[PDB]
Every structure is written in structure tokens, then in C-alpha cells.
Design a protein around this ligand. Sequence first.
Ligand SMILES: Nc1ncnc2c1ncn2[C@@H]1O[C@H](COP(=O)(O)OP(=O)(O)O)[C@@H](O)[C@H]1O
Lengths: 74, 72, 51, 72, 360
Amino acid sequence: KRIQSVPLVIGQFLEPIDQNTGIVSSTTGMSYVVRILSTLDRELLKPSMSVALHRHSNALVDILPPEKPDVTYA
Amino acid sequence: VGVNKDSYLILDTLPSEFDSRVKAMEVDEKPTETYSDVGGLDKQIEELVEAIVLPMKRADKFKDMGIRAPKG
Amino acid sequence: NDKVRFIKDELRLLQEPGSYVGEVIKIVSDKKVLVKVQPEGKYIVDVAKDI
Amino acid sequence: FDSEKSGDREVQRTMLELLNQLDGFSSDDRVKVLAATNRVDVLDPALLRSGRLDRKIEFPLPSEDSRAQILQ
Amino acid sequence: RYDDQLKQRRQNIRDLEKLYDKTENDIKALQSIGQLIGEVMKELSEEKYIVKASSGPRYIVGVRNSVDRSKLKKGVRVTLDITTLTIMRILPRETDPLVYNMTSFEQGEITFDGIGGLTEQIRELREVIELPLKNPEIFQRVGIKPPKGVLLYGPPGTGKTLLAKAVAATIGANFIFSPASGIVDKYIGESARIIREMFAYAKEHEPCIIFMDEVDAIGGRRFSEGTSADREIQRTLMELLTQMDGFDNLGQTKIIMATNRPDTLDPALLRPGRLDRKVEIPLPNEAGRLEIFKIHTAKVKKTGEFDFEAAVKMSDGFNGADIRNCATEAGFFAIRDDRDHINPDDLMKAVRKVAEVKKL
Ligand SMILES: Nc1ncnc2c1ncn2[C@@H]1O[C@H](COP(=O)(O)OP(=O)(O)O)[C@@H](O)[C@H]1O
């Protein structure tokens, strides 16, 4: 749970290859293979979601998720 | 200004050193073509030089009036 | 015991480095191939025991 | 040429410097710029705005009297 | 004798205490190595924020003890270290006085505006804009909602930048103005930060008027292809709209915009209720041009005459801003004849070239 703390680095999931390994094309520019950790969902990742990585390893850590009409029939 | 490589801090000013691909465009007087070598266009050259050498030399006729002068 | 093995194995190697991705152009004679890293240039390489 | 691409921006951004260079100095310091072209139905009127490049020359074709000078 | 040899020393020493403290100052700074600059997307907890550097990436970080977590919100500019990436200090007021500048004397309540050309406009904007600012507690109880914004369209070459500068200065309103060029010329992908600062600064100096020309530049692609490369040309419209909706339209901030091609405008917004009142504008007429030529030409040593009347009747098909040129179209002939007090002969043949200048 320690490394899951700061200072992380962002990325962008692309696709899996195994029960415990996926890939990323981060914002830094390049593409890296990387292993997800357990204690973590899987159901919520396959698209180009948003993610968070561990800097030096370039590992993976945890997930992160996120006009006004005013009228009425009277 | 100058600045360190690792701890970016101002260290020493320095001039504006121009590029070789600009100094090159400075020119000799290799041109040798007098206004007698050109035909017609007594006007256009007459109109031109009333924007160039007189402001280079005789701008007082402008500056005494101080009119909104031309640039190019 | 085999519980604490895993997490102590897993945590050992999230400290592990990254791993790049690339594509093959051809194969040099043996124990030698070439790759282009899909954003960037070429890198002849070696291979491992298994492949 | 509206875009966000590299090649479309770096071009025009030069022009954006040229303007600020024209409108940076005054008619006291004694530069005098000019220019040339084969076309006027193609270029941006911001250069033609009052102050930057105002005086113009409509170089015509030559009248028949001028034809006599040029050949001689 | 042996007193002066010492009296130069008390001067000597103090002339070093100055010297020392400097050379001891600088080393006190060199250890304080540099930092890195970013900007925020959103917020997650006092222990974890998000940032966006000035060299790409979108890091996640923490934060130091001292700085108030209150002031840290979206839009802010930020600074932090290089290794740990922990935010410490803030710098607001992204100054750019080449962009905008105030006119406090425009809060004079008796200011001069006497150039020519146009009267019913300056007469009506006084109606459009005065009352919602001075005592607007009536627009509510009567029932209506006043106009959040305005638009001033017309042909080019008309000198309206000075107009809106003027009439907000006689009324006694704090006027500020920034083109929509440098915000997208100097600032490619760091623009909309300036927008919101341009309002907050404008807020706490309430009341105040806005003016901003070349407004047709925000469009860019206008989502011409929906690619993620024109985010600047897209969002720069977004932050404009979200902010002007935030006024509540109470009567201590109003807005003006302008261009030549309203048919080229971006009615994705600014049409329906934001720039509600659209106002065209005219060109001069048989006497306005003497109302105009009485301005520029009056300010130079001519001979003194009234060929203006017989002149402008020869003039026709004539835009507005070509008149700073028309005088100086003649000034370039007075000096040729080596003169001081010009004659109308330069003016009678002044336009004779200028009419062909309109060709191209
Ligand atoms: N009604 C007017 N009175 C005085 N000068 C004018 C008038 N209309 C245009 N001008 C001249 O035109 C120039 C301003 O035009 P400009 O502000 O560029 O128009 P726009 O803002 O529509 O581009 C000034 O040099 C000014 O002297």
C-alpha cells in the first residue's frame, strides 16, 4: 500500500495480455509493458481508461475515474 | 542570460549573438546599376525615393511637422 | 505460508523495471534479431534461453 | 491557414513576429523596409494595415514609348 | 597629523560591510535551486492533487504543510520540485500589460468623447449599457432579465476600437481591453488561464467594461474535424462561455465584442442569449466626412480653407479608416513642393490615387 502513495505518474491503458500483465502507452510518449498488481479490480480497464503508475518501475498501481437547461412546462 | 545545467539559476548575462545565416545577408556594393540603366518608371522611382533617402537625410521636412511618417 | 510468499514475491518485482514493445523486421542468423520500437528506431538484440 | 499541426503553425508564427517587429519601432530610428511580389489577390491584409506597409507601387506593364527606351 | 590616518579607516570598514553582505547574500540564494511549473486539472484530497506540467505529463503529487489547501483549486498556476514533485508555492496575476491595461480615468464620470461620424450609436449604447450598471435594482422587480452581453459588427476600416474605449470612459466605467491575438499568439496552449484571470481581476475591480477585438480568432477549426490537436481552438471558446454564464448579470460587469464577419461568427454560442443584442453600424455621409476631416486635417499646418464641402461631394464609395491615410496621402506632396502650408490642390488630387488603392 506504500507505493500506491505519491508521486505517481499517469498513463493510459490499452489492452491485456495475461491475468496479471497489461500494457500502457503513457503520456510521456513511449509504450511499456507492465504488470498489474492484485488487490485490484479487472472489470473496468479494457478500454482506453485512465490510470496511475509508479514512476521508476513504470509499474501500475491503481485506477482513477472522474448544457444545464433551466426551463419547465409552466 | 546564462544558466546552470542542473540548478537553473541566472549566472551571467550575455550579448545577442546573431547567426551566420543572417550576417551573410549583409551585403557589399556588388550591385552596379545606375538609374540610367533602367527605362521608364521615372515616377515610381520618384515616388519611392520620397520614402527612403529623404527620411534618411532630410526628415526635418517631416519632423518639423512631425507628421505620421511612413515605414516602408 | 504460501500466501506471504506471493505478496513478497509480487512486491519484489513491481520494483522491477519496465519492458518495451516492438516489432520484427527479419531475423539475423541466430541468437540475433532486429526490432523497431514502434515510435522510434532500430535495435539489434539477442534472445533468451527459451525462445 | 487555420490548424493545430506543426507545419501550419511554425510558418505563420513567423509572420506574427514580423508584424510585432514592424509595430515595435518608430519613424525616428532610420530603417526603411520594402518588399515585392507577383501577387496581391493572395496575401494577408494585416500587412497592408495603415502604418506597416502603406505606400504602394502599381508597377504596370510598359507603355509603347517606354518600349523604345528599354531596347536602346 | 596621526588623526587623519585613522579617519580614513572608519570610512574603509563601512565600505566593506556593504560589500560583505552582498557576497554573503548570493550564496544564500545559490543553494535554493530551481523549480518547475505546472497547472491543475482537478482535486482529489488534501493528500493528493493532480497537476499538469509545462512539458507535457499529468503527474499526481502531494503537497507541503504551509500553503493553504483552500486557495489550491482548478485553473491555478503552480510550482514544485524536480525529484519528489511536491507542490509548495503559487504565483497568480500572469501579467502581460501588452495584452491589457486599465483606464481608471475612464472612471471619471466626466470624460471627453467628441470625435465625429456617429451619434445615435453613442446615444443608444448609453441606453443599452448605462442603466444596468448605475442603479440596476429595478430590472428584477419589473420582471425582465437584462442582456449579459453585446456584439458590435460592421464593415472593416471604421475606427470602433476607440469608440467603445470612449463611451465607457465618459460614463465613468473602468475600461480594459485586450485583443484576441496575443492570447493566442504569445500563448499557444496556455491561453484560457488568461481568460479567467481577466475576469477575476475584473471582478474585484467592479464595475467594469470589457472590450476585445479580433474575436473571430477563437474559432480556429471550430471543431472543423474534431481532432484532439485543436484543443486550444476548442476550449478557448469553452472557458469563455462558462465564465460569462457565471456573472449572474447583476449589473457590475458587462462585455463587448466585435469583428467584421458576423456571418463568419461561431453561433455554437454567443448567438442565442449570451451576445443577445446584435448592433450593426453605418458609414459616413454627405457631412460626416467633414465631421471627420475636421478632425485629422485640422491638426496640421495647412493654408486654411473649406474645400471640404466641394471636396467630399466629389468623394463617394468611401470607407472610414482610409482617412488617416488621405491627409498623409497629401502630406507626401506638400513636402515635395517644399512647402509648409498645403493647398487643396493636393486634396483635390488626393483621392484621385486613393480610389484606385481600393482596387487592391
Ligand atoms: N469615425 C472616425 N473618426 C476618426 N477617425 C477614424 C474614424 N473611423 C476610422 N478612423 C481612423 O481609422 C483608424 C481606426 O480604425 P480601426 O480601429 O482599425 O477600425 P477597426 O477597429 O474596425 O479595425 C484610426 O487611424 C482612425 O483615425
